[PDB]
DNA sequence: CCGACGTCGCATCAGC
DNA sequence: GCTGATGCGA
DNA sequence: GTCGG
């Protein structure tokens, strides 16, 4: 069904990027995902329509695609200069639907036009521009291992009591990642209580961290690069998490996004709620955080077969 | 018919 | 100067 | 755009 899901993803992008209709963006994604998992070749819109997330308007477009191998709206929007320029610019990290509109309105449409107009870009955007190609390359696990080796080593160096845990697709054992996600704790930061700055500073000292998109007391977002053809520049996030909310942190930032969604809806059916900090019991009556001393406890609570990070794709 | 559609930390903007 | 709203990327 | 109160 690849043709149909490429069509739907491309509509979703225009809804988000150009139309600024986030809810139609999500509805097309929701339908692209349920169509992706469906083990038959779709022969009719009405057959699609059986699936949850596929309604009458997507059914119509499936039929037009089946009968013609395209949609008239999509062909038109691609041949539209304004729209397709707005869509493209949002590929720069730090340029969203709003900024891209503003650039395009004032004649700024390509990376070329962005490279000529630095004065009109915020700091995040300049970094996104500067690393445009690099931020779209993937990261083989062998480099993620090398990035990790470095991260754990410098972290332990600053203070032996830190615990650093690489999460995201890495922890799930993916053969390649889009980026590095790192979680951080320390005995002297819990909910009852420079810890991130010091780590970031050390990783800048040894030339691992090359730029900074944003930085606060608990969330850093930035760029790194392995030491030396020189490696691509890579996205890295580091979050400082309360030691006593550690396991909820690791679950959430281990993901995937789609597994967390799943686990959060199941947590509804069994009368609990889960964010990155806590699991709390719910008549909608979300009370106090529960004790947690393993990822498993969180599965124990909502009665779910514990799952290996390995198996948290869906 | 019409409201819901996750939540979060940080940077930047609007407005007093 | 400050607070609160919004943009952005998860 | 899809769903469901
Ligand atoms: N609430 C929320 N959480 C998210 C979202 N996206 C991701 N997460 C959570 C779930 C993720 O597990 C975690 C890391 O975010 P990523 O680095 O963008 N995704 P990953 O590491 O899994 O894949 P790769 O890096 O290979 O692209 O953050 C989101 O949109 N919303
Ligand atoms: Mg990641
Ligand atoms: Na349906
Ligand atoms: Na962007
Ligand atoms: Na990430």
Buried b (16+ CB within 10 A) or exposed e, A230-268: eebbbbbbbbbbbbbbbbbbbbbbbbbeebbeebeeebe
Which ligand 1 atom is the nearest neighbour of the CA of A170? 21
Q: How many residues does chain A have?
A: 314
Topology (CATH level 3) of domain A81-137: DNA polymerase; domain 1 (1.10.150)
**Which residues of A are catalytic, by number?**
61
Q: What is the number of the ligand closest to the CA of A22?
A: 1
Q: C-alpha distances in angstroms, A312 versus A168, A229, A265, A269, A278?
A: 10, 35, 15, 19, 19
Pick the residue whose CA is nearest to atom 16 on ligand 1. A168
Q: Indicate if ligand 1 lies below 6 Å from the C-beta of A93.
A: no
Distance CA A98, CA A104 (A): 10
Pick from A135, A68, A57, A59: nearest CA to A95: A135
Pick from A194, A185, A186: nearest CA to A217: A194
CB hemisphere CA count around A262 (13 angstroms) = 13
Q: Degrees (nearest 5) of the Cα angle A178, A179, A185?
A: 145
Backbone angles phi, psi at A189, to 5 degrees: -130, 110
A232 CA → ligand 1 middle, Å: 21
Pick from A180, A158, A160, A162: nearest CA to A171: A180
A160: Cβ contacts below 8 Å, ≥ 6 apart: none
Q: Degrees (nearest 5) of the Cα angle A227, A231, A235?
A: 95
A210: annotated binding-site residue?
no
Q: What is the 3-state secondary structure (H, E, C) of chain A?
A: CHHHHHHHHHHHHHHHHHHCCHHHHHHHHHHHHHHHCCCCCCCCHHHHHCCCCCCHHHHHHHHHHHHHCCCHHHHHHHCCHHHHHHHHHCCCCCCCHHHHHHHHHCCCCCHHHHHCCHHHCCHHHHHHHHCCCHHHCCEEHHHHHHHHHHHHHHHHHHCCCCEEEECHHHHCCCCEECCEEEEEECCCCCCCCCHHHHHHHHHHHCCCEEEEEEECCCEEEEEECCCCCCCCCEEEEEEECCHHHHHHHHHHHHCCHHHHHHHHHHHHHCCEEECCCCEEECCCCCCCCCCCCCHHHHHHHHCCCCCCHHHCCC
CATH architecture of A253-313: 2-Layer Sandwich (3.30)
Same-fold call for A1-80 versus A253-313:
no
Q: Indicate if ligand 1 lies below 6 Å from the C-beta of A255.
A: yes
Pick from A145, A173, A165: nearest CA to A248: A165
Distance CA A2, CA A8 (A): 10
A9: Cβ contacts below 8 Å, ≥ 6 apart: A28, A29, A32
Helices A246-254 & A257-269 angle (0-180, nearest 10): 120
Q: Please name the method used to determine this structure.
A: X-ray
Which ligand 1 atom is the nearest neighbour of the CA of A237? 17
Q: Indicate if ligand 1 lies below 6 Å from the C-beta of A181.
A: yes
Distance CA A121, CA A183 (A): 30
Task: State which of A249, A256, A276 you would mutate to test the pocket of ligand 1, scoring each by most atoms of that ligand within 8 A of its C-beta.
Answer: A256
Asked if residues A280 and A268 have their Cβ atoms less than 8 Å apart, the reply is: no
A237: annotated binding-site residue?
yes
Distance CA A162, CA A155 (A): 7
Topology (CATH level 3) of domain A138-252: Beta Polymerase; domain 2 (3.30.460)
Asked if residues A274 and A264 have their Cβ atoms less than 8 Å apart, the reply is: yes
Distance CA A139, CA A147 (A): 10
Q: What resolution, expressed in A, was reported for this entry?
A: 2.4
In chain A, where are the structural domains located? 1-80, 81-137, 138-252, 253-313
Task: State which of A26, A30, A169 you would mutate to test the pocket of ligand 1, scoring each by most atoms of that ligand within 8 A of its C-beta.
Answer: A169
CATH architecture of A1-80: Orthogonal Bundle (1.10)
């Amino acid at each position: 069904n690849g043709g149909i899901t490429d069509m739907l993803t491309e509509l979703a992008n225009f809804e988000k990027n150009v139309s600024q209709a986030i809810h139609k963006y999500n509805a097309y994604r929701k339908a692209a995902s349920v169509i992706a998992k469906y083990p038959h070749k779709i022969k009719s819109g009405a057959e699609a329509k059986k699936l949850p997330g596929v309604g009458t308007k997507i059914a119509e477009k499936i039929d037009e695609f089946l009968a013609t191998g395209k949609l008239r709206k999509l062909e038109k929007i691609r041949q539209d200069d304004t729209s397709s320029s707005i869509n493209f610019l949002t590929r720069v990290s730090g340029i969203g639907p709003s900024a891209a509109r503003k650039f395009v309105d004032e004649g700024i449409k390509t990376l070329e036009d962005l490279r000529k107009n630095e004065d009109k870009l915020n700091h995040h955007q300049r970094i996104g521009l500067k690393y445009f190609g690099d931020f779209e390359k993937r990261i083989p696990r062998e480099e993620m291992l090398q990035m990790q080796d470095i991260v754990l080593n410098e972290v332990k160096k600053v203070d032996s009591e830190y615990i650093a845990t690489v999460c995201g697709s890495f922890r799930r054992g993916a053969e390649s990642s889009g980026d590095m996600d790192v979680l951080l704790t320390h005995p002297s930061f819990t909910s009852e209580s420079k810890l991130l700055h010091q780590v970031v500073e050390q990783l800048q000292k040894v030339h691992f961290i090359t730029d900074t998109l944003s930085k606060g007391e608990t969330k850093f977002m930035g760029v790194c690069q392995l030491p030396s053809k020189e490696y691509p520049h890579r996205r890295i996030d580091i979050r400082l998490i309360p030691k006593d909310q550690y396991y909820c942190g690791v679950l959430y930032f281990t993901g995937s996004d789609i597994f967390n969604k799943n686990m959060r809806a199941h947590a509804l059916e069994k009368g609990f709620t889960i964010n990155e900090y806590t699991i709390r019991p719910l008549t909608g009556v979300a009370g106090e955080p529960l004790p947690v001393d393993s990822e498993k406890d969180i599965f124990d609570y909502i009665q779910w077969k514990y799952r290996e990070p390995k198996d948290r794709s869906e």
